Coordinates of all heavy atoms in Angstrom, one line a residue:
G1 N 0.8 -1.2 0.0 CA 0.0 0.0 0.0 C 0.8 1.3 0.0 O 2.0 1.3 0.3
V2 N 0.2 2.4 -0.3 CA 0.9 3.6 -0.6 C 1.5 4.2 0.7 O 2.6 4.6 0.7 CB 0.0 4.6 -1.3 CG1 0.8 5.8 -1.7 CG2 -0.5 3.9 -2.6
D3 N 0.7 4.2 1.8 CA 1.2 4.9 3.0 C 2.5 4.3 3.5 O 3.4 5.1 3.7 CB 0.1 4.8 4.1 CG -1.2 5.5 3.6 OD1 -1.3 6.3 2.7 OD2 -2.3 5.2 4.3
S4 N 2.6 3.0 3.6 CA 3.8 2.4 4.1 C 5.0 2.6 3.1 O 6.1 2.8 3.6 CB 3.6 0.9 4.4 OG 3.3 0.2 3.3
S5 N 4.7 2.6 1.8 CA 5.7 2.9 0.9 C 6.3 4.3 1.0 O 7.5 4.6 0.9 CB 5.2 2.8 -0.6 OG 5.0 1.4 -0.9
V6 N 5.4 5.3 1.2 CA 5.8 6.7 1.4 C 6.5 6.9 2.7 O 7.6 7.5 2.8 CB 4.6 7.6 1.2 CG1 5.0 9.1 1.5 CG2 4.0 7.5 -0.1
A7 N 6.0 6.2 3.8 CA 6.8 6.2 5.0 C 8.2 5.7 4.8 O 9.1 6.2 5.4 CB 6.0 5.4 6.1
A8 N 8.3 4.6 4.0 CA 9.6 4.0 3.8 C 10.5 5.0 3.1 O 11.7 5.2 3.5 CB 9.5 2.7 3.0
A9 N 10.1 5.6 2.0 CA 10.9 6.5 1.3 C 11.3 7.7 2.2 O 12.5 8.1 2.1 CB 10.2 7.0 0.0
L10 N 10.4 8.2 3.0 CA 10.7 9.3 3.9 C 11.8 8.9 4.9 O 12.7 9.7 5.2 CB 9.4 9.8 4.5 CG 9.6 11.1 5.3 CD1 10.0 12.2 4.4 CD2 8.2 11.5 5.9
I11 N 11.6 7.8 5.6 CA 12.5 7.4 6.7 C 13.8 7.0 6.1 O 14.9 7.4 6.7 CB 11.8 6.2 7.5 CG1 10.6 6.7 8.2 CG2 12.8 5.7 8.5 CD1 9.7 5.6 8.6
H12 N 13.9 6.3 5.0 CA 15.1 6.0 4.4 C 15.9 7.3 4.0 O 17.1 7.3 4.2 CB 14.9 5.2 3.1 CG 16.2 4.9 2.4 ND1 17.1 3.9 2.8 CD2 16.7 5.5 1.3 CE1 18.1 3.9 1.9 NE2 17.9 4.8 1.0
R13 N 15.2 8.3 3.5 CA 15.9 9.6 3.2 C 16.4 10.2 4.5 O 17.5 10.9 4.4 CB 14.9 10.6 2.6 CG 15.5 11.9 2.2 CD 14.9 12.4 0.8 NE 15.1 13.9 0.6 CZ 14.7 14.5 -0.5 NH1 14.0 13.9 -1.4 NH2 14.9 15.9 -0.6
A14 N 15.8 9.9 5.6 CA 16.3 10.5 6.9 C 17.5 9.7 7.5 O 18.4 10.3 7.9 CB 15.1 10.5 7.9
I15 N 17.4 8.3 7.5 CA 18.3 7.5 8.3 C 18.9 6.4 7.5 O 19.7 5.6 8.1 CB 17.6 7.0 9.5 CG1 16.5 5.9 9.2 CG2 17.0 8.1 10.4 CD1 15.9 5.3 10.4
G16 N 18.7 6.3 6.2 CA 19.5 5.3 5.4 C 19.4 3.9 5.9 O 18.4 3.4 6.3
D17 N 20.6 3.3 6.0 CA 20.8 1.9 6.4 C 20.3 1.6 7.8 O 20.3 0.4 8.2 CB 22.2 1.5 6.3 CG 22.7 1.2 4.9 OD1 21.8 0.9 4.0 OD2 23.9 1.4 4.6
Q18 N 19.8 2.6 8.6 CA 19.2 2.3 9.9 C 17.8 1.7 9.7 O 17.3 1.2 10.7 CB 19.1 3.5 10.7 CG 20.5 3.9 11.4 CD 20.5 5.4 11.8 OE1 21.3 6.1 11.3 NE2 19.5 5.7 12.6
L19 N 17.2 1.8 8.5 CA 15.9 1.3 8.3 C 16.0 -0.1 7.6 O 16.8 -0.3 6.7 CB 15.1 2.2 7.3 CG 13.8 1.6 6.8 CD1 12.8 1.5 7.9 CD2 13.3 2.5 5.6
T20 N 15.2 -1.0 8.1 CA 15.0 -2.3 7.4 C 13.5 -2.5 7.2 O 12.7 -2.2 8.1 CB 15.5 -3.5 8.2 OG1 16.9 -3.3 8.6 CG2 15.4 -4.8 7.4
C21 N 13.1 -2.8 5.9 CA 11.7 -3.0 5.6 C 11.5 -4.5 5.4 O 12.4 -5.3 5.1 CB 11.3 -2.3 4.3 SG 11.3 -0.5 4.5
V22 N 10.3 -4.9 5.7 CA 9.8 -6.3 5.5 C 8.7 -6.3 4.5 O 7.6 -5.7 4.7 CB 9.4 -7.0 6.8 CG1 8.8 -8.4 6.5 CG2 10.6 -7.1 7.7
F23 N 8.8 -7.0 3.4 CA 7.8 -7.1 2.4 C 7.3 -8.6 2.3 O 8.1 -9.5 2.1 CB 8.3 -6.7 1.0 CG 7.3 -7.0 -0.1 CD1 6.1 -6.3 -0.2 CD2 7.6 -7.9 -1.1 CE1 5.1 -6.6 -1.2 CE2 6.6 -8.2 -2.1 CZ 5.4 -7.5 -2.1
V24 N 6.0 -8.8 2.5 CA 5.4 -10.1 2.5 C 4.5 -10.2 1.3 O 3.5 -9.4 1.1 CB 4.6 -10.4 3.8 CG1 3.9 -11.7 3.7 CG2 5.5 -10.3 5.0
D25 N 4.8 -11.1 0.4 CA 4.0 -11.4 -0.7 C 3.1 -12.6 -0.3 O 3.7 -13.8 -0.2 CB 4.8 -11.7 -2.0 CG 3.9 -11.9 -3.2 OD1 2.7 -12.2 -3.1 OD2 4.5 -11.9 -4.3
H26 N 1.9 -12.4 0.0 CA 1.0 -13.5 0.4 C 0.3 -14.3 -0.8 O -0.6 -15.0 -0.5 CB 0.0 -13.0 1.4 CG -0.8 -11.8 0.9 ND1 -0.8 -11.5 -0.4 CD2 -1.5 -10.9 1.6 CE1 -1.6 -10.4 -0.6 NE2 -2.0 -10.0 0.6
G27 N 0.8 -14.0 -2.0 CA 0.2 -14.6 -3.2 C -1.1 -14.1 -3.6 O -1.7 -14.6 -4.6
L28 N -1.6 -13.0 -3.0 CA -2.9 -12.4 -3.3 C -2.7 -10.9 -3.7 O -3.6 -10.1 -3.6 CB -3.8 -12.5 -2.1 CG -4.0 -13.9 -1.7 CD1 -4.8 -14.1 -0.4 CD2 -4.8 -14.6 -2.8
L29 N -1.6 -10.6 -4.3 CA -1.3 -9.3 -4.8 C -1.6 -9.3 -6.3 O -1.7 -10.3 -7.0 CB 0.2 -8.9 -4.6 CG 0.6 -8.8 -3.1 CD1 2.1 -8.7 -3.0 CD2 -0.1 -7.7 -2.3

């Protein structure tokens, strides 16, 4: 979804490698 994607881009711009994201493909995308 868009919100978490935008949160990710924003936080990564702030703190770089301090961020780890988890993406789950449940087969229903």
Side-chain angles (χ1 to χ4, degrees):
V2 182
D3 298 343
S4 63
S5 285
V6 176
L10 187 61
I11 294 160
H12 174 80
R13 182 141 162 183
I15 68 177
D17 285 332
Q18 283 160 240
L19 169 69
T20 306
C21 293
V22 174
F23 172 68
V24 177
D25 185 344
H26 50 20
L28 300 169
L29 299 172

